[PDB]
Amino acid sequence: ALQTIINARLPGEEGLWQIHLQDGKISAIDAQSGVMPITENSLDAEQGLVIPPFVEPHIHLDTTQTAGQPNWNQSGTLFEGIERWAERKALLTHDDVKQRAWQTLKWQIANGIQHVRTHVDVSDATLTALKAMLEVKQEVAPWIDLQIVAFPQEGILSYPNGEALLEEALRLGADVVGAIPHFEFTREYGVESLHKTFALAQKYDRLIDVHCDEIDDEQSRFVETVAALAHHEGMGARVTASHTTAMHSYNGAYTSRLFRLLKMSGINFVANPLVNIHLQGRFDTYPKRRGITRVKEMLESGINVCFGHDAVFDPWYPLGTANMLQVLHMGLHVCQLMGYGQINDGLNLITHHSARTLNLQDYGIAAGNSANLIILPAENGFDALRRQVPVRYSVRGGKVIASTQPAQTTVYLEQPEAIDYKR
Amino acid sequence: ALQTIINARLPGEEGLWQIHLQDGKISAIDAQSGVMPITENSLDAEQGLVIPPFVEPHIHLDTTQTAGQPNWNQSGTLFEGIERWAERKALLTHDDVKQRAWQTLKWQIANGIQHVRTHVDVSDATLTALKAMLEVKQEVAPWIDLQIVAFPQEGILSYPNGEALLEEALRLGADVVGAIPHFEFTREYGVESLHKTFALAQKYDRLIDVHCDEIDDEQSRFVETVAALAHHEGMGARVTASHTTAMHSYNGAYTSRLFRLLKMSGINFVANPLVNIHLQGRFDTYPKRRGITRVKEMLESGINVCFGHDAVFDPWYPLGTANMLQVLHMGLHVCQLMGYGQINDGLNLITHHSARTLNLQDYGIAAGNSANLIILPAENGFDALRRQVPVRYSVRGGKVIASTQPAQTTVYLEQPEAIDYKR
Ligand SMILES: O=C1NC=C(F)[C@H](O)N1
Ligand SMILES: O=C1NC=C(F)[C@H](O)N1
Ligand SMILES: [Fe+3]
Ligand SMILES: [Fe+3]
């Protein structure tokens, strides 16, 4: 029955703070002028950093843990990945999807992630994975608020009954409408697919998250239609453009023109560093492009951008432990957001910016909000990122739902010495 | 009460000529076999060059003289320019627009310009600048025939009530319908905006002048729609594509295909050398492209192309004295039209070709035409351009409306010597 979080550091704030908890919510936040004593019912942050929970804005829980089944993606490309997934999709069973999704979700809970948006392939007349995921959503609710995107992986207009299946998925309860314009057979189908996606989102009052321009094609500009339709409907807050890796290859003049619309539209952007560095640049010899969208410029322009893990051991990515600080680490390097302040503020890319992408209404350390927060054994964002620290405690509804007793490293010199990699 | 212009040289003609004037018109033109004596009622061209008036086919009189108000365009780009202008547009007043427009118009009269096409931003519900410019048009009529383009600077489909405001501007009397497809939110809005522009021009029997592809984007090809719609409606003579700077970046194969249509369509092209060299190439590091449309190739293909000043001390250009020979000088250098004949024929780019762009019906030194002409103290186009000569006399309706007493330079060597920079 926790009543207070004491000795907490907060990003962008000086000193220590006390967070009072009442009835599963944050009742008040007060600055401390020194270190407070521990006591029963008090969770001691020990001058560590307290932040709202990590968020996973983009993952594929229906494909997670399937890498190599029945075959491996040899080329390491998005296109072969979809082909390898199609082979696995034909072998799906309800229980298998639930088991694999739950395996990755447990890693996420352990990693302080309390909000997850999973795409689920609905280019499947049986909607096997979707039915399984809707059950997982209910089962995992005490620990993670899971959003499900009805993702038409093989296209809306380019797959048999694609539009009907996408709508069926919404009627079954999917929270977000997906699309993949660059995978449609033609540019015209791509644009038309977006009009259909927006019409469905307005008909059912759902969010939108488009796999948008995930291709090293300087002519893949579906993002301008996503932003324009959102602006026209006055619904930018409910819309997300995932990937936009083609933007890495656009000329600068078009990008500058486009940025005005991106800002005016208010839509969100998701970059997936671990997967993008792996799948993009595969058609270059040397030099080889990085292939991540224009994260640095978006931040400078005040456009909301955040980071997702995208895949965890599946056709598009052979690694991962569903760790957001690891995703952030890769993104900061590839996007060259390596200034001290840029690294320190990096936490926003896996917390607040992602919460905005998911249109969350109860997020942040503020009075009145649910007591959902995590404690990192680090002094600030820079320190947490540099040392790739685990989540010491994850609190949800005012209760501890995960904890990590840190590793203990000792070197035996003339005398034993504890090493914590700090300075 | 001038009755004759004597000792006149004419471009492309040998010898001297006499131009007889009667009732404000040119009654006859006769060759001379020698130098004629001066006499009362005779304006002596003194073997200088006589040409129809200079023309300014593209200028923004509503923004002229506002550079730095309230802020400067730091990046030197078209996009920031529009943003800086938006800030100034919110501060417009009727009298301020009239005063600034008249300041630049007086410089134009002094520079022998008797025909001017000004764009006026109509992405403004108050249409403040347009109302002011319609009054200026009437006031300046004795000296300059001013055409007003209803220019939807912030887009037709991408600005609130953009189409209604564009039509309102035509109902108030604007002479030309404008558009800016590359600034619309999407390629589809760009193309649609052109269909709407042409429909308005046919509904009101007005000319068209599109700010077309003014961007270093090799995919900005709105010019093909402008030309195709003009060809379909059989109205090329009434249509102009301004800038087309993207053409500088097109691959050669597409450009060759496009050129057939450009020629067949009969539309006009305006290049704005002083502004284009400044605003284009801003997204390149090194090498840096010039960014002017394909003027040399247009001339070789018989496509009508001409030069405008575009801006005089405003968001898009911090310099200028509204001097067409200076605009021509820049264009010849950047477009590499540096052969003797190319330079000598350069005057066509600021006289006859521009008159065609404005669809002028009374222009040129020919019997029956109004006696509107200017006298340059130079032997030919090459000489006028090299020495950047002023306009000795500007005649309109058979009367002198401007004159420049040339500067007198002397060097004091062993004896004083007059220097005129001639050879
Ligand atoms: O279309 C896609 N499917 C799965 C992925 F992991 C990648 O995000 N893109
Ligand atoms: O769109 C534009 N507005 C103003 C200029 F000077 C430039 O011609 N382009
Ligand atoms: Fe994905
Ligand atoms: Fe212009």
Residue ranges in A234-380 assigned as alpha helix (H): 252-265, 273-279, 295-301, 324-334, 340-344, 352-357
Buried b (16+ CB within 10 A) or exposed e, B339-365: eeeebbbbbbbbbbbbbbbbbbeebbb
End-to-end CA distance of chain A: give it in Å, rounded.
36
Ligand 2 binding residues, C-beta < 6 A: B 60, 78, 153, 180, 211, 214, 275, 310-311, 316
3-state secondary structure B204-240: HCCEEEEEECCCCCCCCCHHHHHHHHHHHHCCHHHEE
Which of B58, B59, B78, B274 to mutate for ligand 2's pocket (most ligand atoms within 8 Å of CB)? B78
β-strands B113-121, B176-179 pairing: unpaired
Residue B375 phi, psi (nearest 5): -120, 120
Q: Which two tokens stand for residue B128?
A: 């403040």
Closest CA–CA distance from residue A301 to any residue of chain B (Å): 13
Q: How far is CA B344 from the centre of its chain?
A: 19
Task: For chain A, give every residue range classified as CATH 3.20.20.140.
Answer: 54-361
Query: Hey, is A29 helix, strand or coil?
Result: strand
How far apart CA B38 and CA B6 sit, in angstroms, is: 8
Q: What angle do CA B73, B75, B76 make, to 5 degrees?
A: 70
Which residue has tokens 């001290």? Answer: A340
Residues 6+ apart with CB under 8 A from B234: none
How far apart CA A295 and CA A349 sit, in angstroms, is: 10
Question: Is A256 in the B-facing interface, judged by CB distances under 8 Å?
Answer: yes
Closest CA to A248 of A283, A285, A291: A291
Q: Which two tokens stand for residue A114?
A: 């309390």
Which residue in chain B is spatially nearest to A223 when comparing CA positions? B186
How far apart CA B332 and CA B295 sit, in angstroms, is: 9
How far apart CA B210 and CA B177 sit, in angstroms, is: 8
> Method of determination?
X-ray
Q: Please tell me the total number of residues recorded for chain A in this structure.
A: 423
Residue A41 phi, psi (nearest 5): 80, 5
Residue B214, Ramachandran bin (φ over 0: left; ψ between -120 and 50: alpha; else beta): beta
How far apart CA B42 and CA B18 sit, in angstroms, is: 10
Q: Which two tokens stand for residue B24?
A: 């404000």
How far apart CA B276 and CA B278 sit, in angstroms, is: 5
Task: Look at B217 and A256 and tell me if their CB atoms are within 8 Å.
Answer: no
Closest CA to A81 of A279, A309, A270, A293: A279
How far apart CA A295 and CA A277 sit, in angstroms, is: 14
Which residue has tokens 């090329």? Answer: B236
| Helix axes A94-110 and A128-140, enclosed angle (nearest 10) | 40
- Single-letter amino acid, residue A177: V
Closest CA to A115 of A288, A304, A303, A364: A364
Closest CA–CA distance from residue B211 to any residue of chain A (Å): 15
Furthest C-alpha separation in chain B: 72
Nearest-by-Cβ selection for A251 from B79, B158, B283: B283
How far apart CA B392 and CA A48 sit, in angstroms, is: 81
Residue B196: how many other CB atoms lie within 10 Å: 18
CA distances (Å), origin B363, targets B209, B278, B352, B353: 20, 32, 8, 11
3-state secondary structure chain B: CCCEEEEEECCCCCCEEEEEEECCEEEEEEEECCCCCCCCCEEECCCCEEECCEEEEEECCCCCCCCCCCCCCCCCCHHHHHHHHHHHHCCCCHHHHHHHHHHHHHHHHHCCEEEEEEEEECCCCCCHHHHHHHHHHHHHCCCCEEEEEEECCCCCCCCCCHHHHHHHHHHCCCCEEEECHHHCCCHHHHHHHHHHHHHHHHHHCCEEEEEECCCCCCCCCHHHHHHHHHHHHCCHHHEEEEECHHHHHCCHHHHHHHHHHHHHHCCEEEECHHHHHHHCCCCCCCCCCCCCCCHHHHHHHCCCEEECCECCCECCECCCCCCHHHHHHHHHHHCCCCCHHHHHHHHHHHCHHHHHHCCCCCCCCCCCCECCEEEECCCCHHHHHHHCCCCCEEEECCEEEEECCCCCEEEECCCEEEECCCC
* Contact status, residue B188 vs residue B198, Cβ threshold 8 Å: no
How far apart CA A201 and CA A198 sit, in angstroms, is: 5
Sign of CA dihedral A101, A206, B159, A217: positive
Beta-ladder partners of A310: A59
How far apart CA B176 and CA B119 sit, in angstroms, is: 9
CA distances (Å), origin B144, targets B148, B174, B398: 12, 16, 14
Resolution of the coordinates, Å: 1.4
| Helix axes B162-171 and B187-204, enclosed angle (nearest 10) | 20
Question: Is B254 in the A-facing interface, judged by CB distances under 8 Å?
Answer: no
Question: Is A241 in the B-facing interface, judged by CB distances under 8 Å?
Answer: no
Residue A315: how many other CB atoms lie within 10 Å: 25
How far apart CA A182 and CA A194 sit, in angstroms, is: 11
How far apart CA A166 and CA A200 sit, in angstroms, is: 9
Query: Hey, is A401 helix, strand or coil?
Result: strand
Please tell me the CATH code under which domain A54-361 is placed.
3.20.20.140
CA distances (Å), origin B197, targets A31, B184, B206, B232: 62, 13, 10, 14
How far apart CA B209 and CA B241 sit, in angstroms, is: 6
Residues 6+ apart with CB under 8 A from A333: none
How far apart CA B185 and CA B154 sit, in angstroms, is: 10
- Run of H or E including A164: helix A162-171
Regarding the domain with residue range A1-53+362-423, which homologous superfamily does it belong to in the CATH classification? Urease, subunit C, domain 1 (2.30.40.10)
Name every chain A residue with its beta carbon within 8 A of the beta carbon of B217: 251, 253-254, 257
* Contact status, residue A281 vs residue A292, Cβ threshold 8 Å: no
Q: Of residues A87, A167, A214, A218, which has the active-site annotation?
A: A214
Confirm whether residue A211 is marked as ligand binding. Answer: yes
Q: Which two tokens stand for residue B298?
A: 């247009």
Q: Whose CA is nearest to atom 4 of ligand 1?
A: A316
From the DSSP assignment, how many helices (H) and strands (E) are in chain A? 13, 18
- Single-letter amino acid, residue A154: E
How far apart CA B52 and CA B371 sit, in angstroms, is: 9
How far apart CA B183 and CA B165 sit, in angstroms, is: 17
β-strands A42-44, A4-8 pairing: parallel
Task: For chain B, give every residue range classified as CATH 2.30.40.10.
Answer: 1-53+362-423
How far apart CA A244 and CA A421 sit, in angstroms, is: 37
Which residue has tokens 């309109």? Answer: B396
Residues 6+ apart with CB under 8 A from A302: A263
CA distances (Å), origin B321, targets B61, B223, B278: 13, 30, 16
Question: Is B218 in the A-facing interface, judged by CB distances under 8 Å?
Answer: yes
Q: Which two tokens stand for residue B120?
A: 């006026």
Closest CA to B392 of B145, B22, B51: B51
Residue A196, CB-side half-sphere exposure with 13 Å CA sphere: 20
- Run of H or E including A417: strand A416-419
- Single-letter amino acid, residue A329: H
* Contact status, residue B248 vs residue B284, Cβ threshold 8 Å: no
Q: Secondary structure of chain A: what % helix, strand, coil (to 5)?
A: 35, 25, 40
How far apart CA B190 and CA B176 sit, in angstroms, is: 18
Closest CA to B276 of B235, B234, B247: B247
Confirm whether residue A333 is marked as ligand binding. Answer: no
Which residue has tokens 């038309």? Answer: A192
- Single-letter amino acid, residue A66: T
Buried b (16+ CB within 10 A) or exposed e, A111-139: bbbbbbbbbbbbbbeebbbbbbbbebbee
Closest CA to B266 of B297, B302, B213, B225: B302
How far apart CA B304 and CA B57 sit, in angstroms, is: 13
Q: What angle do CA B167, B170, B172 make, to 5 degrees?
A: 115
Residue A417 phi, psi (nearest 5): -140, 135
Q: Please tell me the total number of residues recorded for chain B in this structure.
A: 423
Beta-ladder partners of B268: B240
* Contact status, residue B50 vs residue B373, Cβ threshold 8 Å: yes
How far apart CA B220 and CA A254 sit, in angstroms, is: 9
Q: Is the peptide bond before B37 cis (omega within 30 degrees of 0)?
A: no
How far apart CA B399 and CA B422 sit, in angstroms, is: 30
Q: Which two tokens stand for residue B52?
A: 């129809």
Ligand nearest to the backbone CA of A56: 3
β-strands A49-51, A42-44 pairing: unpaired
Query: Hey, is A174 helix, strand or coil?
Result: coil
* Contact status, residue A178 vs residue A152, Cβ threshold 8 Å: yes
Residue B172, Ramachandran bin (φ over 0: left; ψ between -120 and 50: alpha; else beta): alpha
Query: Hey, is A379 helix, strand or coil?
Result: coil
Sign of CA dihedral B141, B147, B149, B150: positive
Which residue in chain A is spatially nearest to B181 when comparing CA positions? A257
Q: State the binding site of B.
A: 58, 60, 153, 211, 310, 316
How far apart CA A234 and CA B147 sit, in angstroms, is: 38
3-state secondary structure A66-122: CCCCCCCCCCCCHHHHHHHHHHHHCCCCHHHHHHHHHHHHHHHHHCCEEEEEEEEEC
Residue A152, Ramachandran bin (φ over 0: left; ψ between -120 and 50: alpha; else beta): beta
Q: Which two tokens stand for residue B262?
A: 């450009």
* Contact status, residue B109 vs residue B402, Cβ threshold 8 Å: yes
* Contact status, residue A220 vs residue A266, Cβ threshold 8 Å: no
Minimum-distance ligand 2 atom for the alpha carbon of B242: 8
Q: After which residues is chain A broken (C to N over 2.5 A)?
A: none
Q: Is the peptide bond before A70 cis (omega within 30 degrees of 0)?
A: yes
* Contact status, residue A269 vs residue A305, Cβ threshold 8 Å: yes
Question: Is B79 in the A-facing interface, judged by CB distances under 8 Å?
Answer: yes
Q: Is the peptide bond before A287 cis (omega within 30 degrees of 0)?
A: yes
Task: Look at B186 and A228 and tell me if their CB atoms are within 8 Å.
Answer: yes
Residue A380 phi, psi (nearest 5): -170, 180
Q: Is the peptide bond before B318 cis (omega within 30 degrees of 0)?
A: no
